[PDB]
Design an enzyme around this catalytic site. Sequence first.
Site, PDB file in Angstrom:
ATOM      1  N   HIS A   1      36.313  32.643  34.564  1.00  0.00           N
ATOM      2  CA  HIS A   1      37.353  33.631  34.826  1.00  0.00           C
ATOM      3  C   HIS A   1      36.906  34.620  35.898  1.00  0.00           C
ATOM      4  O   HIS A   1      37.670  34.958  36.800  1.00  0.00           O
ATOM      5  CB  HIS A   1      37.711  34.360  33.526  1.00  0.00           C
TER       6      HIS A   1
ATOM      7  N   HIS B   1      38.615  36.674  39.607  1.00  0.00           N
ATOM      8  CA  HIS B   1      38.406  37.999  40.183  1.00  0.00           C
ATOM      9  C   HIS B   1      37.800  37.963  41.579  1.00  0.00           C
ATOM     10  O   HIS B   1      38.327  38.579  42.504  1.00  0.00           O
ATOM     11  CB  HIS B   1      37.511  38.838  39.268  1.00  0.00           C
TER      12      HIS B   1
ATOM     13  N   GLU C   1      44.429  41.994  36.502  1.00  0.00           N
ATOM     14  CA  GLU C   1      44.419  40.825  35.633  1.00  0.00           C
ATOM     15  C   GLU C   1      45.699  39.988  35.704  1.00  0.00           C
ATOM     16  O   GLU C   1      45.641  38.765  35.600  1.00  0.00           O
ATOM     17  CB  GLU C   1      44.176  41.254  34.181  1.00  0.00           C
TER      18      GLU C   1
ATOM     19  N   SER D   1      43.207  32.226  36.223  1.00  0.00           N
ATOM     20  CA  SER D   1      42.277  31.517  35.341  1.00  0.00           C
ATOM     21  C   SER D   1      42.960  30.854  34.149  1.00  0.00           C
ATOM     22  O   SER D   1      42.308  30.191  33.342  1.00  0.00           O
ATOM     23  CB  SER D   1      41.195  32.471  34.834  1.00  0.00           C
TER      24      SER D   1
HETATM   25  C1  LIG Z   1      40.694  47.673  31.356  1.00  0.00           C
HETATM   26  C2  LIG Z   1      40.589  46.755  30.138  1.00  0.00           C
HETATM   27  N1  LIG Z   1      39.170  46.496  29.793  1.00  0.00           N
HETATM   28  C3  LIG Z   1      38.501  47.387  29.053  1.00  0.00           C
HETATM   29  O1  LIG Z   1      39.054  48.412  28.659  1.00  0.00           O
HETATM   30  N2  LIG Z   1      37.172  47.147  28.730  1.00  0.00           N
HETATM   31  C4  LIG Z   1      36.575  45.975  29.190  1.00  0.00           C
HETATM   32  O2  LIG Z   1      35.397  45.769  28.899  1.00  0.00           O
HETATM   33  C5  LIG Z   1      37.283  45.112  29.929  1.00  0.00           C
HETATM   34  C6  LIG Z   1      38.568  45.372  30.224  1.00  0.00           C
HETATM   35  N3  LIG Z   1      39.042  44.366  30.961  1.00  0.00           N
HETATM   36  C7  LIG Z   1      38.056  43.493  31.104  1.00  0.00           C
HETATM   37  C8  LIG Z   1      38.139  42.187  31.901  1.00  0.00           C
HETATM   38  C9  LIG Z   1      38.948  41.083  31.212  1.00  0.00           C
HETATM   39  C10 LIG Z   1      39.638  41.185  30.084  1.00  0.00           C
HETATM   40  N4  LIG Z   1      40.190  39.989  29.846  1.00  0.00           N
HETATM   41  C11 LIG Z   1      40.977  39.365  28.944  1.00  0.00           C
HETATM   42  C12 LIG Z   1      41.229  38.080  29.221  1.00  0.00           C
HETATM   43  C13 LIG Z   1      42.087  37.138  28.372  1.00  0.00           C
HETATM   44  S1  LIG Z   1      40.495  37.660  30.584  1.00  0.00           S
HETATM   45  C14 LIG Z   1      39.820  39.170  30.853  1.00  0.00           C
HETATM   46  N5  LIG Z   1      39.053  39.854  31.696  1.00  0.00           N
HETATM   47  N6  LIG Z   1      36.967  43.935  30.484  1.00  0.00           N
HETATM   48  C15 LIG Z   1      35.672  43.186  30.461  1.00  0.00           C
HETATM   49  C16 LIG Z   1      35.480  42.571  29.217  1.00  0.00           C
HETATM   50  C17 LIG Z   1      34.208  42.151  28.840  1.00  0.00           C
HETATM   51  C18 LIG Z   1      34.015  41.538  27.604  1.00  0.00           C
HETATM   52  C19 LIG Z   1      35.086  41.344  26.736  1.00  0.00           C
HETATM   53  C20 LIG Z   1      34.903  40.753  25.556  1.00  0.00           C
HETATM   54  C21 LIG Z   1      35.859  40.514  24.674  1.00  0.00           C
HETATM   55  C22 LIG Z   1      35.238  39.915  23.666  1.00  0.00           C
HETATM   56  N7  LIG Z   1      33.945  39.817  23.983  1.00  0.00           N
HETATM   57  C23 LIG Z   1      32.910  39.206  23.119  1.00  0.00           C
HETATM   58  N8  LIG Z   1      33.744  40.302  25.085  1.00  0.00           N
HETATM   59  C24 LIG Z   1      36.358  41.762  27.109  1.00  0.00           C
HETATM   60  C25 LIG Z   1      36.549  42.371  28.346  1.00  0.00           C
HETATM   61 FE   LIG Z   2      39.286  39.767  34.019  1.00  0.00          FE
END
Ligand SMILES: CCn1c(=O)[nH]c(=O)c2c1nc(Cc1cn3cc(C)sc3n1)n2Cc1ccc(-c2ccn(C)n2)cc1
Ligand SMILES: [Fe+3]
Lengths: 342, 334, 334, 342
Positions: free
Chosen positions: D170, D175, D215, D234
Amino acid sequence: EDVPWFPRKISELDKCSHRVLMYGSELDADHPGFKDNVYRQRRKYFVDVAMGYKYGQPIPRVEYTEEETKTWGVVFRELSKLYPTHACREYLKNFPLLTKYCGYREDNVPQLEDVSMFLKERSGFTVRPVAGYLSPRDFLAGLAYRVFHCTQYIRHGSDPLYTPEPDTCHELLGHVPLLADPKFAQFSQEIGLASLGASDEDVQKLATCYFFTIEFGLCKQEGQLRAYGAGLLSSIGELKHALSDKACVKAFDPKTTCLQECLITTFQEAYFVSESFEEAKEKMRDFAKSITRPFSVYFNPYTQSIEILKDTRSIENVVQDLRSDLNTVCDALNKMNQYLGI
Amino acid sequence: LEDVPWFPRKISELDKCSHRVLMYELDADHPDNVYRQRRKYFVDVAMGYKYGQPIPRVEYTEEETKTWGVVFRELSKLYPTHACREYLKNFPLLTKYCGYREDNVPQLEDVSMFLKERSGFTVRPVAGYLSPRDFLAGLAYRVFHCTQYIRHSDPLYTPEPDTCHELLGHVPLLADPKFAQFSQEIGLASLGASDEDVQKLATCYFFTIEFGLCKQEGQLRAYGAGLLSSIGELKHALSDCVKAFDPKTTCLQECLITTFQEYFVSESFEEAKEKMRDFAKSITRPFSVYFNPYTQSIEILKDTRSIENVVQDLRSDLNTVCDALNKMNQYLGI
Amino acid sequence: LEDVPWFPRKISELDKCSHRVLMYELDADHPDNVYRQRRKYFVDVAMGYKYGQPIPRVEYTEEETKTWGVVFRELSKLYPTHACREYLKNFPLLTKYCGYREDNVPQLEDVSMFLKERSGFTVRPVAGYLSPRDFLAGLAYRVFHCTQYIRHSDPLYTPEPDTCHELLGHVPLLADPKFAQFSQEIGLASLGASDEDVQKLATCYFFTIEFGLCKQEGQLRAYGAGLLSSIGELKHALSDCVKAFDPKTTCLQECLITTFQEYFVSESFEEAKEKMRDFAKSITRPFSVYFNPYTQSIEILKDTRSIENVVQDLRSDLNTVCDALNKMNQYLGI
Amino acid sequence: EDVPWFPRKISELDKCSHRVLMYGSELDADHPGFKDNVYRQRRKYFVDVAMGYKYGQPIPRVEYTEEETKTWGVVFRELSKLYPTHACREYLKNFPLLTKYCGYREDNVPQLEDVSMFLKERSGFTVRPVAGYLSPRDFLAGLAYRVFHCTQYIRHGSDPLYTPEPDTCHELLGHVPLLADPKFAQFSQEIGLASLGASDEDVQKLATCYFFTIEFGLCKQEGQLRAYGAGLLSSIGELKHALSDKACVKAFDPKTTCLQECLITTFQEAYFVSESFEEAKEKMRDFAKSITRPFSVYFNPYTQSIEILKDTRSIENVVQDLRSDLNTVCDALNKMNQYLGI
Ligand SMILES: CCn1c(=O)[nH]c(=O)c2c1nc(Cc1cn3cc(C)sc3n1)n2Cc1ccc(-c2ccn(C)n2)cc1
Ligand SMILES: [Fe+3]
Ligand SMILES: CCn1c(=O)[nH]c(=O)c2c1nc(Cc1cn3cc(C)sc3n1)n2Cc1ccc(-c2ccn(C)n2)cc1
Ligand SMILES: CCn1c(=O)[nH]c(=O)c2c1nc(Cc1cn3cc(C)sc3n1)n2Cc1ccc(-c2ccn(C)n2)cc1
Ligand SMILES: CCn1c(=O)[nH]c(=O)c2c1nc(Cc1cn3cc(C)sc3n1)n2Cc1ccc(-c2ccn(C)n2)cc1
Ligand SMILES: [Fe+3]
Ligand SMILES: [Fe+3]
Ligand SMILES: [Fe+3]
């Protein structure tokens, strides 16, 4: 060189002002004064006053008749009953000012010369008495110079609450209070500037934008809908309807809005709302980029003429100008730190 | 709150400055009672002018006209040789539209409407000497105060500004947009300044406008209005003292009314103006000034709201710069 | 199309400039074979450095360290008295974070990471003399080329730049954001310039950075790196020739390697830099240069599209200025 | 001083990167690898790699397993079949570049260190391996420095076409191709800058804007709808649906869009479209004004730190800076007139 002519200096604007497609003396078949011969004398007298207008000459003062002064009065009281609740902040602020300096009183019809000198001091607008309908190219050309063309005649006294044509009442109570706002003035000028040397198709779109903004625009202030459209502010029936619960209301976007049709008779399908005139002005200026013409235009308020930006030398001077003006900003910030320790 | 000395904040307020004449009135040295008859008239006219009305047209006597022609011929003789490019470009234009002819006296109204189109300047008939604060205040509005009378006896000798000096010395340069910017800059600087600062500006004004030289094409040419007006001095400045124009250093130097100056040079008016603005910051006042050409008024930069409003405007003007550049690529691929 | 002399367009391309060493190598006058043993090592290290890897840490001999301490004490004696405000503000910071101690030799990696945070400069160990084109090119990227070796016999006498000179002369000023802007400006000017112009910049660089003075508080203080490095000369410049820093006039003047200069003064670095940019326009090249700190590359302003892109950016930055002013009114009513 | 902490220099960003609310090793109950013990070893190995990351140290290279390399390959071919017709111009331009320099090949999983050095050269972005979910404050804080936090693990091989969580696939295919666009990079940084020291409510709104733009945003180019949303690029099922005829699609407006709810599982009710990233970036910067904080922030790309604009002295230097840069514009215009006679 195949680009349609536009006035390049303020004195040239007279050609636009006098290219009247339809004179005020030409009443339409369903006009309330169509068989009023006393009224056509006034209508043709106003056309004469306007036709005689020339650059560098004070706007003629006109002595209105008693049935014109009450007809004004009638429109004046009914609309004043709805301005506190239906008009924008800008309107309600400038309107008492007009009473003090331009003679906005129920028993007195304001003179264009007064209104012109008032607008020049507040926002750089000046009014012109116009003898009738202009091509949208010619009408919008005036805006580029911050010149608004005004009818000087009063509507028919038979039905003072509704008119299908512009009359002095509309100009004075609808347009002028908003033209007194500097931010609104810039917005109006942007529409004009955009038209200069544009194609007929683009001019019509700008004219459409003018219609749904200047004539019939709404604005959102502090979470509430208020009218700034001049056509709204001069028509009580439409004004009440525009802010009514059962109304289709959409956000003002130049590219979207400009394709819609303008209805002369029936109430408009939708009304467009602008957060602010600065906000609307910048949407115009980005719309102006999309408009096809071989050059950009810079307005020179010192010489009251149009600069054509077709080379790097003129573009640089503009940029140099902006550099000096930014220096003043620094001076101002220096002085403020100097005197207030901030 | 207004501790600072009053200055006009609106174009209409400038009437107060014009009419506050310290000295309308002739010295023993100055030359004729009939001449005095005409002068009081001229003063009466200037006093009678108020904002918004056309500058009165005057029927000149033949005596005034013959004298005008004399100075007109003498000055013209050395203009190609001693005057700057701007003068020489603008002088033929004055002939076609303002009636600049050896046999005729141009009217202020003709010249005023000429300057407004060319550079945004307008002239005012003035009833006499004004305080330097008041005179420079006019410049802030791109308003030049002009005497409307003619020099009496000797045509070449002049002890005071007259319309010949105003029309032949100042007007051809007032027609140049950049010179216009420079003159206005001096006026803006003066607004609400201390008397001390205003005089330093008066000196700067004197060396620059009344008597300035500027190099062009590598060649020394005069742009000083006093120089344009007076031939002996004009010939002399070019002929073998010369110093660079720096406002802070220049203001210090005195002006001799009668004798020849011990002269300042500027590469350009854009140059001079910049050195002027940089000078204006050192000038003591609680505020900065922005000029509004739309309302013809003065904006006072004392708070953040006024400062932002300028910056937003400047943002928009930069968008126009961008538009120009797009179009230029659009049509020329460059 | 590339008639113009090549310059690095990306930070990674700057490696080519660093390694093109005209002269690594000692003269008869210079002092010891054991010293030569260490120097070849130092050169080997500098030659071994490439972009993106940490500057190698070096274990200095006691002999090098004792000498470092000597110069450290002598220079410190007169720093409050002869050094500019920026030096004196930054020197205590160097002590806490970069190991600036009489008994210790600071490492380039410590100093580099220090400068990057303070002003965006980073140092490179250099293997010898570079062409002025190449040396100044580093400045365009805010990269200072530093010798990593120590001066041999006499501690006070130095005929070539060494790390003592680099660390005690240059670094405290490289930490100042405005000085940083000024140094970069000289480098930018050089990019793709003619050899003729580059040398004039080298002279300007010399008088300004190696040997410049600047007034502060009305007082004469030295900011020249050469001056900071050498005490006799440092004392002498303040003591009774002084001239204003003007790039066009200054470049004309020669640099004597051995003798004392016949010295240039700047009110500020902001001042100097402006005079530099105004100088850069006269420099012959078909293009202007914009530096991209995000990609650490050079933008070439040759078309309208590149020029617009800058202007749009500047529009945005002005919006931030506006935001700041709103907030300031919001919280202080001012 | 009651304003929530934000990193003020680049090295401080480590606190944000390591404040992991939920680690990658913590598989959700309905995760396809929830009972795969071989897969948790990899997941916990990736968490370890990320946790060990520190500022000033190269991003660790990782040797991927064969079933991770094909799972990558699977996602790689199916999406490549839809990129020419579903992806934005910016994507399709940068994607071949990634194949040449970052090893974007079906048989090879790209390394973050490669991708980071590539992005730095093209737009000033750099990637960080992240050990899990961050607070939206911490995640958006990275954007302010043009730092994108990336997962380094591969999704489960059981169902490579759909993942409810971010995986390296992804990050790399969704990205990175867009982060390579300078205009897009500025847009991303604007969202970050806006969050710095903002209230939790404002951060969530910005996070919502991030969601529906970065996203799941669409963009209109030459009269056609293309996806630039990384989540769209993705997910084939969503990607096809987003451009499908029966989809609710609305224009991107920060104030409107930010109030909507984000759906993790089901397809989104609406998708937002931006005319351009410059266009979207300026809507962010006007949204940023409405965000409550006692100061404005300026990003110093030289020192990679945040400037706080709380006085006239710092505001003036910024303005002075802009004056010098405008001088360069003049130089450029001079040279152009000088050499081309224009
Ligand atoms: C602004 C919202 N936002 C936030 O608040 N905080 C973030 O950390 C975040 C995010 N957005 C993204 C990126 C992302 C979120 N997401 C959901 C998909 C389906 S594909 C994808 N890429 N992240 C990075 C991220 C890193 C890890 C996880 C994750 C979920 C479950 N695990 C074990 N890990 C989820 C998101
Ligand atoms: Fe993402
Ligand atoms: C951009 C459109 N637009 C144009 O293209 N050209 C314009 O001349 C124009 C205009 N818009 C407005 C102003 C206006 C139009 N209008 C209609 C109302 C109902 S109230 C009102 N005010 N005018 C001025 C104007 C002046 C005179 C008439 C007119 C109609 C019938 N008569 C005898 N005179 C109509 C309009
Ligand atoms: C900044 C100095 N400065 C000032 O402080 N105030 C000014 O009023 C002024 C001026 N400067 C100039 C213009 C001027 C003054 N002056 C003298 C010449 C010899 S030629 C010439 N042109 N004026 C206009 C002016 C108008 C009238 C007179 C005058 C002198 C004697 N009388 C009867 N009238 C003198 C000057
Ligand atoms: C613009 C002139 N300029 C140039 O054209 N090229 C440069 O390489 C340069 C420089 N200027 C400075 C910095 C410097 C030079 N220099 C001489 C001092 C005595 S103190 C001092 N600092 N350098 C760096 C440098 C690096 C090495 C040497 C050198 C001399 C003898 N060796 C064996 N090595 C000399 C200078
Ligand atoms: Fe109307
Ligand atoms: Fe004069
Ligand atoms: Fe040095």
